[PDB]
Every structure is written in C-alpha cells, then in structure tokens.
C-alpha cells in the first residue's frame, strides 16, 4: 500500500535507520558500485571493438559460389565411390553425404546405405569412422 513509485520495504527502512550514518554509507556503496560497473562496460566495449576490427572483411573472400545440381536418380560408379568416402568421413550424417555427391537426395543416400550395405562393407566403414 505505498504511493505508486514510492519505495519503502521494511528491509530497506531498517538498513537506512539501523545506524546514525547508515543512510550515507548505503548510498555511498551504491555510488562506488555503479562506478565499477561503468568501468567494466568501458573494458568490454574496448575489447569488443578490437574483436570487430578482426572481423573486418567478413568471410566474403572465402565464400564459394553455390551450385545447384539436378537431383539424379541413377548412381554412377564415381558417385558410389564418393558416397563410400563420405560415409568413411561423416558417418550417418545423411545430409553432409548428400551435399558431397551433389546429385543425390537424403533419401537416396539412406537407401544407398541398405542396398550396398553388403557389397561395400558399409558396416565395416561405419565402424572405421567410429575409431577416430
């Protein structure tokens, strides 16, 4: 029931009146606390400003052009050999494997796993990828 925007907790009233010079001590430590928070903002601004200066140039010198490839249903020998290496490197990451081959959907990759499971020792190859 205090007036709106007035602030009057029992806790604070006792703190400002427990002692003859309690109030000024309270407001003093709050002042110094604000000083050390502003000091700390200055350090992080200046630290972040140096980081931004390293990101000058973005990653534009390093972005490759994006090629779209018509997703083909048929597996050339070359594309099979890519997939086996992609399995060796990426494991069950069907998306990464699709991106490496370029013309094979995530489903076609997953289907490839079963059909050539036997002939390509795909189980051995997954075990091989797990050792590192």
């Amino acid at each position: 029931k205090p007036p709106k925007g007035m602030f009057l907790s029992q806790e604070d009233v006792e703190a400002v009146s427990a002692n003859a010079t309690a109030a000024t001590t309270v407001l003093r430590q709050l002042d110094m606390e604000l000083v050390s928070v502003k000091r700390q903002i200055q350090n992080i601004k200046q630290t972040n400003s140096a980081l931004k200066e390293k990101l000058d140039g973005g990653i534009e010198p390093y972005r490759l052009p994006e090629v779209i490839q018509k997703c083909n249903a048929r597996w050339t020998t070359e594309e099979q050999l890519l997939a086996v290496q992609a399995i060796r490197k990426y494991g069950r990451d069907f998306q990464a494997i699709s991106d490496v081959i370029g013309n094979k959907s995530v489903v076609q990759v997953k289907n490839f796993f079963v059909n050539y499971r036997r002939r390509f020792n795909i189980d051995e190859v997954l075990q091989e990828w797990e050792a590192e």
Partner: protein, 661 residues
C-alpha cells in the same frame, strides 16, 4: 436539510446522540429509539432556530411556540433540551440582544486569567448564567494572540488572520454577530526562486505532487511498518521524511545499477559471440586455402582427389552457414545494446532546484504547524484532521481584533494586571497579581473558582511566571512538558502603492538552503490598503527574533525587489515585526502535537484541579481550578475557534459545578 444542517453547523451528528448528551439524558439514550428520534429533532430544531438568527436570545418559551406536534407535547423534554444547549454554549453564545435583562442577583465569584478569546467567551457565558466574573489581563488590550496592528488606514493582523471554512465553524455565528469583513482567500500562489524568477508551471506541479506523495509515504511508514520509535525515541514527521527521501535516492541508484548490469550482461554475451566468430573466421580462412589447393590438382584425378575437393567444398559452405547465423545474432545483440544505451533510468531523485522548491513546501507545513518538522509527532501530527470545517478559508479584512473587542463589551476586565500566583484550597481561591506598569502594586482577588487560560508557552516557563499554590500535580505538569508550543512570526509592510499582483493573495519565495527555508518564504496580500505580510516559519522563526527590524525589512525588500524590479518597490511607510516567542504573555504562537505527545495530552490540559480537604477527614472538595485555551481542546487545537469553544466548555462546566445543572 434544515434541522440536519443545524446539527452539522453545531459539529453534531444529526441522527445520533453524543456522549455529552448521553450523560445529561441517560433516560433517553438507554430508552426506546422513538424517544431518541424525538429528542434528536428537538435538539436539531432548537439549534436551527438559534442559527437562523443568532442576534437575539432564543428562550425556552420562544423555542416551544415554534415546535409543532408531536414534539411540543413533552414540555419537560423541550425545556431540558433547551437548557442543555444553553448551558453548553450551543445556543445563546457570543454577542446577542437579551430578551430578559440580566438578573441583579449574582451567584458565585469567578476570576478568569487572560482575556484572549477563550477567556472572553467563558466570561460572557458565566455572566449570562448569573455569576460574578472578573478577568485579569497582563497586556493593555484584550484579544491575546488575536492582535491587530492599526495605524492610519493601515490594518494588519500580527496573530490570527484566517477564518477556516465556515461550515461547522462557531466563528460563522460570531461573524453574523460582529461586523467582520470576511473575504475569500484565492489559493493561487506563484513561487519565485531566490533569483526572483518564477517557478515554471511544469516544475511547480511536479514538486508539489512529490511533496504530497512523500507525506503519504511517511503515513505508510507510520501505519504499516510501525516506524514510530527509533533508538528508544519517538519518530518525528521530519525524521520520517528523511528516511523516505533516502529510500527514493536509494531506489534511483538501485535502478541505475540494474540498468548498467543489463548492459554488462549483454556486452559479455556479445564478447563471447565475437570470440566465436573470430575463431570461426580463421577456421574458414584456413579451410578455403585447402579447398583452393585441392581444386588446383587439375583433372583428371582419382576419386579420392575428387572427394577431397567436394568434401572441402562441403565443409567450407557449412562453416560459412554457421558464420552467417552468428553474424545474424550479432546484429540482434547490437540492437538490444543500442536500446539499453538509450533507456537510461533517472539520474537523480531530486535536482538542487527541485529540493529547494520541495523545501518551500516543507516550510509551508512548518508554517501551518508553527514548528520545525523535526518536532512533530509522526504518529499524531495530523490527529485533528478528521474535524476540518467545510468551505473556503477567509481573512478578516478589518482586523481580527474586532472579535475580542466585541466580546469584551460588558465584562469586568482589569488590564495591566499580571497574575503572579494562583492559590486554591477546599474553601476557595486567591489570585495574586501586580500592576505591569509598577510591579510593586499588589492585588488579591478572592473567588470561588479560577479559570486559567494562560498560554501553554507561559505554563511551560522555567522558572515560572505564575506559581500555583499548591503546585499543579504531576499528571498536569507532565502534559505541559510533553505538549509542543511552537512559533511563527509576521512582517507587516505598509506601502503607499501596490506593486504586486492585486488578484493574487499569496506568493512564495523559495529560499536557497534547507536551513533558511522558513525565512520570509510566503507573502500575503489581504487588505484594502497596500499591505504585504511576510511569514517567518520553522527554524527561522526563533532565529529571526534576534535580528533587528531594519535588517528583517531589508531582507524583505531585497526579495520583493528581485521579484518585481528595483524601481518598483518603494520603501515602506510603516513596518511591524512580531516576536511571539519573546512575548512574555505568549512565549510562542500556538501548540503542536510534539513527538512523544498525543491527543490525550489536550484532554489532560482541560481537566480541572481539585484541592485536598482543609480539615482531614472532611468530604471531597469540589474542583477549584479550571483550564481553557487553544491548548486545551483536542479536536480544534491552535485556532481561534478552538479557543472560543474551550471557553464555552469551561463555562458550562463551572456553572454546572457552582449553580447546579
């Protein structure tokens, strides 16, 4: 309504009997509701007839002829009600033409100390009741703290000047009996900071509102946190205001710390993100170089060389996608951080100019209570608040003294007679007084009863101005110690021409420091002739009493010259400065509810003193020493109407004692 208005104008509930009435009509209040309603109508209608014409005595026969059936059937009841109203001063008080001339046989002898308003009102009553009354007055005039300066056409009140609302106010009746020129006080009151410039309306209103909110806060502090004793002493209004202000200053700092901490938290979240990006950029830079080398192994290549190009390509675009998301998050954080950097909470609770204008409002409260806020009881300082009259405040244009002078007509008043000693025993009283002009002339007044209306300041005096033999009991002297008696002074400035705003009755001067906030803080334009009154309140009151009039008037003219211009303010033709604390017949201005006191001390002040028996084993004596004055009336202290009411009370009490009820 009419009969209902009569009750309201007599400060009575119209539909209920009071404790006083219960005491004189126990048969009626303990009896059926129907008779209580009949009683209440008789009382309200008798009050009404009196109020509708307070210039002539309302007699019992007159009253009865005006009552109509069924109410005029119980003539004993009507006569009882009329006698009760008359005896207690609710009808036939003040100055009225008497139908039946006063009987020559007087009964009992009363000495009244003091011929201020309380003393005079009691005296008129007691004489109306058939008693022999003499007033002893130390000054060379009546009125006491109603004190009007008169010189030429200049008229200005050095003491009381405001009649509060007329609704319920007994001064309403008096004003129909005396030619008082009452004039409304327009409460518009511009403030001028110490540089003579006006306070902008924006600021005048902000700070006044904050002032009202700080008061509510102290009351919350009092009633909800029970912050009423601190380090074994009663908390004062001023002290509670300090705590409230300290906490508002604390909250501003708490709010700043919370705000800059949100900025730190966000900055650090951004720092962590940038480090993530810088490392990712390097990882991307190195990966590109690898994709570049592998793709420069020119075809035709075996399928592992092809896989190297295509998987470096894949790894690089993924890292680029990761980097693009981190850079989207970076722009959102820099947004959040630019909004925070633009929403800073308030810098200060009050600026210096604010706190000065605030001090003016505190000085205004120190004026109304005639005392520094550090002396007011936090718990009780506004305890008479529920009794405020209704209507506009008014000034007495022809000088408030017209009231006590009018009341004095017909009374036996010994001016220039300072009471030195009050003697009261089971057989009667002796009042010993001296001539103030030559103190060697001693006077003895013997009487059945003494009504003491000495100001609370005089009762407080150590060593005493007035000795009571036997000494007042401790329950009364302790009350006298606890009660506050404050101080307030006025500077009357009489010019030959009006240079202020004529349509503005008040204007304020905002002092530069808290210490000086009460010093000449308020000016009044109230009179027909060009007169300004300037107030000295709070801590300034007592200090300015030890400064010469020429310096005080100088400070006044300096303030006014700053507000209105140096060429606009001529020298005053006449000036007067009050020094009420130094006045030995007052020793202050009026009472206040001090920290450590309360409303019950006003009841204690009002209680009469009863001496012990002369012969031991003799029956209980009657009371002999009575008290009236503004310090004796709980619900209307520190006013003229309170003093008048207190005299009416004591006269009923004394007459009941010595004439019988």
């Amino acid at each position: 309504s009419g009969v209902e208005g009569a009750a309201f104008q007599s400060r009575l509930p119209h539909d209920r009997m009071t404790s006083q009435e219960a005491a004189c009509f126990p048969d009626i209040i303990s009896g059926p509701q129907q008779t209580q309603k009949v009683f209440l109508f008789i009382r309200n209608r008798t009050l009404q007839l009196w109020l509708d014409n307070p210039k002539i005595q309302l007699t019992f026969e007159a009253t009865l002829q005006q009552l109509e059936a069924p109410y005029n059937s119980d003539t004993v009841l009507v006569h009882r009600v009329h006698s009760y109203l008359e005896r207690h001063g609710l009808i036939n008080f003040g100055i009225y033409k008497r139908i039946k001339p006063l009987p020559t046989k007087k009964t009992g002898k009363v000495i009244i100390i003091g011929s201020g308003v309380s003393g005079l009102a009691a005296a008129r009553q007691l004489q109306s009741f058939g008693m022999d009354v003499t007033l002893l007055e130390a000054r060379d005039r009546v009125g006491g703290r109603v004190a009007t300066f008169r010189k030429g056409n200049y008229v200005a009140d050095l003491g009381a000047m405001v009649v509060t609302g007329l609704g319920g106010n007994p001064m309403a009746v008096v004003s129909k009996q005396v030619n008082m020129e009452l004039a409304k006080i327009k409460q518009k009151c511009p403030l001028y900071e110490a540089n003579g410039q006006a306070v902008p309306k924006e600021k005048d209103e902000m700070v006044e509102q904050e002032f009202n909110r700080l008061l509510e806060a102290t009351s919350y502090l009092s009633h909800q946190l029970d912050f009423n004793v601190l380090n074994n002493k009663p908390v004062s209004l001023g002290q509670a205001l300090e705590v409230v202000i300290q906490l508002q200053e604390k909250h501003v700092k708490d709010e700043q710390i919370e705000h800059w901490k949100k900025i730190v938290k966000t900055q650090e979240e951004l720092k962590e993100l940038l480090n993530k990006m810088v490392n990712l950029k390097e990882k991307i830079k190195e990966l590109h170089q690898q994709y570049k080398e592998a793709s420069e192994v020119k075809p035709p290549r075996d399928i592992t060389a092809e896989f190297l190009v295509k998987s470096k390509h894949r790894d690089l675009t993924a890292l680029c996608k990761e980097y693009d998301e981190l850079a989207e998050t970076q722009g959102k954080l820099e947004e959040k951080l630019q909004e925070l950097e633009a929403n800073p909470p308030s810098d200060v609770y009050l600026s210096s100019r604010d706190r000065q204008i605030l001090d003016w409002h505190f000085a205004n409260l120190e004026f109304a209570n005639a005392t520094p806020l550090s002396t007011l009881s936090l718990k009780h300082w506004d305890q008479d608040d529920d009794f405020e009259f209704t209507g506009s405040h008014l000034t007495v244009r022809n000088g408030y003294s017209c009231v006590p002078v009018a009341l004095a007509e017909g009374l036996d008043i010994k001016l220039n007679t300072a009471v030195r000693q009050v003697r009261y025993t089971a057989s009667g009283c002796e009042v010993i007084a001296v001539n103030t002009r030559s103190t060697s002339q001693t006077f003895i007044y013997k009487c059945d009863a003494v009504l003491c209306t000495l100001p609370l300041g005089v009762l407080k005096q150590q060593p005493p101005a007035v000795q009571f033999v036997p000494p007042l009991p401790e329950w009364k002297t302790s009350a006298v110690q606890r009660m506050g008696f404050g101080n307030l002074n006025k500077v009357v400035l009489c010019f030959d021409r009006v240079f202020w705003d004529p349509s503005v009755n008040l204007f304020g001067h905002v002092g530069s420091t808290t210490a000086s906030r009460g010093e000449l803080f308020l000016f009044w334009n109230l009179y027909k002739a060009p007169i300004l009154l300037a107030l000295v309140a709070g801590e300034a009151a007592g200090i300015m009493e030890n400064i010469s009039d020429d310096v005080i008037v100088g400070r006044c003219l300096a303030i006014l010259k700053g507000i209105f211009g140096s060429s606009a303010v001529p020298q005053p033709k006449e000036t007067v400065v009050s020094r009420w604390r130094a006045d030995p017949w007052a020793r202050g201005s009026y009472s206040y509810v001090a920290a450590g006191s309360s409303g019950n001390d006003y009841d204690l002040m009002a209680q009469p003193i009863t001496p012990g028996p002369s012969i031991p084993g003799a029956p209980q004596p009657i009371p002999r020493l009575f008290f009236a004055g503004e310090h004796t009336i709980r619900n209307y202290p520190a006013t003229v109407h309170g003093a008048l009411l207190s005299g009416l009370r004591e006269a009923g009490r004394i007459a009941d004692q010595f004439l019988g009820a």
